[PDB]
């Protein structure tokens, strides 16, 4: 029973490793924040006709 439990913990730690590496890969560095609390200008081009 203890050894079967150990195999189950091996399975759970390997899926933990899988989700950990997935989170590490998806974390990325998309946090430049080039905005701040300053005066910012926005320009958009679109053609609406309803």
């Amino acid at each position: 029973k203890l050894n079967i439990l150990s195999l189950d913990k091996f399975k759970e730690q390997e899926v933990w490793k899988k989700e950990n590496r997935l989170a590490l890969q998806k974390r990325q560095k998309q946090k430049f924040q080039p905005n701040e609390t300053i005066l910012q200008f926005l320009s958009t081009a679109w053609l609406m006709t309803p």
């Binding site: 029973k1 203890l2 050894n3 079967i4 150990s6 195999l7 091996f10």
Partner: protein
């Protein structure tokens, strides 16, 4: 074979599995998935542990 020796006979004393390094884990997992009624020891990893 070892399971039959341990069940039919009351002798399951310390046995040795001499294996190449790469399969060192696999063997201790081979009967971890399979018959787990044995107590397995793995010998490696620096003098301390």
């Amino acid at each position: 074979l070892l399971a039959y020796l341990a069940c039919e006979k009351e002798n399951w004393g310390p046995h040795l599995i001499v294996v190449p390094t790469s399969v060192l884990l696999n063997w201790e997992m081979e009967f971890k998935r399979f018959a787990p009624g044995f107590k397995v020891l793995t010998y490696y990893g620096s003098p301390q542990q």
